Amino acid sequence: LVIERGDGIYVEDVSGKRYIEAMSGLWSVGVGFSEPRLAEAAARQMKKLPFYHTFSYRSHGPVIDLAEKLVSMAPVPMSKAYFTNSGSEANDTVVKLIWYRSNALGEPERKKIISRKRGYHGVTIASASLTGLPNNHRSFDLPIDRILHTGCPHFYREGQAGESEEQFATRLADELEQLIIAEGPHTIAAFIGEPVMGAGGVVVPPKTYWEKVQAVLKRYDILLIADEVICGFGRTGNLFGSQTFDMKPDILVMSKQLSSSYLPISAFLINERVYAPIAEESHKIGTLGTGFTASGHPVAAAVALENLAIIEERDLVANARDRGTYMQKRLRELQDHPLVGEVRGVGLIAGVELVTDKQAKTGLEPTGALGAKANAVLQERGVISRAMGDTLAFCPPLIINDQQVDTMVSALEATLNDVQASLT
Amino acid sequence: QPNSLEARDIRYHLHSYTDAVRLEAEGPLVIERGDGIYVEDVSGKRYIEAMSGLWSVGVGFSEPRLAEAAARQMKKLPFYHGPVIDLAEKLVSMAPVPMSKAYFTNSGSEANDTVVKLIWYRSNALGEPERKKIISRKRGYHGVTIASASLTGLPNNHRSFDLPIDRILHTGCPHFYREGQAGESEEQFATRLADELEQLIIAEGPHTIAAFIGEPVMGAGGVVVPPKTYWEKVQAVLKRYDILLIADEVICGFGRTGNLFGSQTFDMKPDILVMSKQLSSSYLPISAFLINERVYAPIASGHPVAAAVALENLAIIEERDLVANARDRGTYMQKRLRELQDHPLVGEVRGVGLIAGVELVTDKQAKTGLEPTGALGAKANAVLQERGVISRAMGDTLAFCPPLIINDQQVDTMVSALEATLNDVQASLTR
Ligand SMILES: Cc1ncc(COP(=O)(O)O)c(CN)c1O
């Protein structure tokens, strides 16, 4: 599919056919595809100071404004923001700084990071190791040493016979605790998780998961890294997924909706517990020996600022919350469709996992075929979704209205009816 | 003034490559705007940006054509996962040796990281699970991801970070002034480096070595120009053991060394070429790497706004003859800088094309500076900045890497400021 242009929630192919971009591109184009104020911010900044770096005691106005704004918006108290170009680089730098921090605290053995199966955190050698999907690892010799993976919190696929949702949450927290014990708790630096796993299939954790996991972490004083690359800036019904799931991270990683992907920029926030010992170590060494050339890029930072100003002025968090409520309700009305195994989601993100045998939870051979089949029909009906195996994902822009949500979910129902007719 | 830019920076902003405790005490220097080769701080003082920012702002700091390219794309299709296709085609067509495919990333770091990951994937696809080691060099700079900071050969990039990771090796720095033994000539030193590389390869098991990575000229490690014959002798080694050559042209690319690529200046024939920086003049973040058919055969999403800017940047370079401009001003800069070789504070002047390093010492026979090494560099860089020129100190070396748009009169101004700076520093040391 060759996409050429976009407008609001829509994109157009070269032939002129219009689609709802129900993924907001790559989970990221929050303000839609034609926000003129972002081009205005970019052009203005690029003619004033198109580039300056933030190395060696240098700065500029856009990065200063954006650092202040991100710290001020944090869902828990934070101390500093640090800027990169991507989500992958941010998670990579986070891992490195955790290792530095542990060295800075006299803990040379506290270097292990716990991630999760089906988690997605990037593509660098380190951040692809954090990622818990098989194809990111296969043939790349990953994961690197120090990166561990605990279970995926996906009740529909991991729950045991007869187990309840809250028991499943208890079992995942207990399995985490067993992992920490078996490794040696003093060796565990951090735990990383997305509030809701996006790329892994829009996996919403079971109720009480994050409370119980945080209890475990807190017992051993392990750092929590909230990966808000997808969930950040209104996706889940609040400004951050950490608010929606009552998470209290030490480190919060952002990208994507930060600039609505109009330019490459990413950031993470660290609290005082993280910052203070890194600062002291940088002073003994003489510098903090990391950073990307374009870290804090002034044009990207100007666009991000204007993007956040628009999300606040137009009440887009609330807009996403309310259209999300409607979308979640509409999608769950398809539960009794013969092809619908599970509907899951919160706020303005959802997944619909397709099956041909509800009791066995199985689809066509191989798993993925059913999702590919339905996704082709859905596209043909004017809706671009992402297939993750047999799950179709929905993550539309924050500017969507109810009428557009109705259009998108009706196309999904007509799609599933079509696919059902092809198989009978 | 709690609401000044400087105060707000100290409160909220964790900087790269900065001592955080010192930043809290002094605050940043805040840059406001740019004009050609100049930038201006928030207090209104102007400086020649003799480093082009971070070796990167090739077209200077006020090129409104790039602003229009960005806005045009941003108003058509601001993102999707056309300019990316056009840019890939252009980079392949400009390559200094035949190339097959272009891949995009945001940063030089991610490019190098991806290159390492692709090499591993490739050796696995070829059924060579042990051919995974990468040889880099001391003082090399290749970026800051966990993998690419491991390729980097500088201690500030490793200390307290637990790097380098396994599989990354480092051979010697090809810096004759610092590494040449008593009575060794420049060419003999080249011979010895190629021999030490070969010894490394033999000792590790040649079947285990996948690739060698080098910058044609090492930038961030101090503008180290390799000895004559080095690249020829190295390349003969690597070819003997079928090792891939990765040319990291992040700095050297797009006219910096007197030719379009540093690979042409040094007669390198890489299999993989990494680019960033002058690719877009840093007006937006974008990087790329190219691979040849040898690389691509067993293994057979750029950002569109960034790509549209990189395309327009390349067109400007081409239309305004900036590679030739840089070559000719480079010839003049290198001659002017070498006029300071006899200065009592100058240990060495080195450089090619439009990049150079002036290494400072206080005892020219011992090749020693002030205590500790770094103090003399820092001192002179501060005085040069008072004189309106922004250089970058790498220990006791001051770097010069000005915009491709610079003219001879500006070169003259820059080098005269350095001369007066060295005279002032020498005077202060005698008091
Ligand atoms: C030769 C070289 N390679 C790689 C990099 C890394 O680029 P970035 O800062 O964009 O990650 C740099 C940046 N100074 C460089 O000079």
The secondary structure of A314-359 as a DSSP string is TTHHHHHHHHHHHHHHHHHTTTTSTTEEEEEEETTEEEEEE-SBTT
Measured distance CA(B386)–CA(B379) in Å, rounded: 11
Asked whether the beta carbons of residue A50 and residue B283 sit closer than 8 angstroms, the reply is yes
Mutating which of B5, B6, B12, B305 best tests the A interface, going by the most A Cβ atoms within 10 A?
B12
Planar angle of CA A227, A228, A234, nearest 5 degrees: 165
Both tokens of B304, joined, read: 């569109």
The Cα–Cα gap between B369 and A330 comes to: 73
Top CATH class, B1-62+321-431: alpha beta
DSSP B363: B
E-assigned strands of B80-174?
101-105, 133-137, 168-171
User: Beta-carbon neighbour count of residue A36 at 10 Å?
Assistant: 10
- Residue type at A116? R
**With the C-alpha atoms ordered B11, B14, B20, B26, is the resulting torsion angle positive or negative?**
negative
Helix (H) / strand (E) containing B53: helix B52-55
**Do B212 and B238 meet the contact criterion of CB atoms below 8 Å apart?**
yes
* Beta strand pairing call for B272-275 and B244-248: parallel
d(CA B142, CA A342): 46
How many residues can be counted in chain B?
Answer: 431
Would you say the C-alpha torsion B69, B74, B75, B80 has a positive or negative sign? positive
CA distance A308 to A267: 14
Q: How was this structure determined?
A: X-ray
Mutation to test the B interface, candidates A57, A110, A146, A280, most B Cβ within 10 Å: A57
Atom of ligand 1 at shortest distance to CA of B219?
16
Do A89 and B74 count as a contact with CB atoms less than 8 A apart?
A: no
User: Is A35-314 in CATH node 3.40.640.10?
Assistant: yes
With residue B31 as reference, give the H or E element that holds it.
strand B29-35
Which residues have C-beta within 8 Å of that of residue B18, sequence separation ≥ 6?
A55, A56, A57, A282, A287, A288
DSSP per-residue string spanning B232-287: HHHHHHHHHTTPEEEEE-TTTTTTTTSSSSHHHHTT---SEEEE-GGGTTTSS--E
* Extended strands (E) in B65-108: 101-105
Which are the contacts of A124, defined by CB distance < 8 A and separation ≥ 6? A88, A89, A91, A92, B110, B113, B114, B117, B145, B146, B147
Closest CA to B37 of B421, B388, B422: B388
Rounded Cα gap, residues B29 and B382, in angstroms: 12
Residue A57 burial (CB count, 10 A): 16
Pocket-forming residues, ligand 1, beta carbon under 6 Å: A 292-293; B 54, 107-109, 112, 141-144, 215, 219-220, 248, 250-251, 276
Residue B370 DSSP class: S
| B20, B54, B120: residue with CB nearest A55 | B54
How many CB atoms lie under 10 A from the CB of residue B61?
Answer: 27
CA nearest to B376, candidates B394, B389, B388? B394
Contacts of A377 (CB under 8 A, 6+ apart): A415, A418, A419
Cα–Cα distance measured from residue B76 to residue A370, given in angstroms and rounded to the nearest whole number: 34
Give CA–CA dist B395/B367, Å, rounded. Answer: 13
Strands of the B38-41 sheet, one edge to the other: A58-60, B29-35, B38-41, B46-49, B389-390
d(CA B176, CA B331): 22
List the single residue in A64, A70, A100 with the smallest CB-CB distance to B9: A64
Beta bridge partners of A80: A270
Q: A261 contacts in B (CB within 8 Å)? A: 78-79
Q: What's the reported resolution, in angstroms, to a tenth?
A: 2.0
A337 phi, psi to nearest 5 deg: -60, 140
Residue B295 gets the label, from left (phi > 0), alpha (psi -120 to 50) or beta, of alpha
C-beta separation of B74 from A44 below 8 A? no
Q: Which among B181, B375, B286 is positioned nearest to A299, based on CA atoms?
A: B286
Give every CB contact of residue B232 below 8 A, 6+ residues apart in sequence: B267
- Rounded CA-CA distance A304/B112 in Å is 27
The beta-carbon neighbor of A50 closest among B9, B34, B74 is B34
Architecture of domain B63-320 in CATH? 3-Layer(aba) Sandwich (3.40)
List chain A domain ranges: 1-34+315-424, 35-314
What's the burial of B94, exposed, middle or buried (CB within 10 Å: 0-12/13-18/19+)? Answer: middle
CA distance, residue A181 to nearest chain B CA (Å): 24
What is the SS3 assignment for B355? strand
* B63-320 has the same fold as B1-62+321-431: no
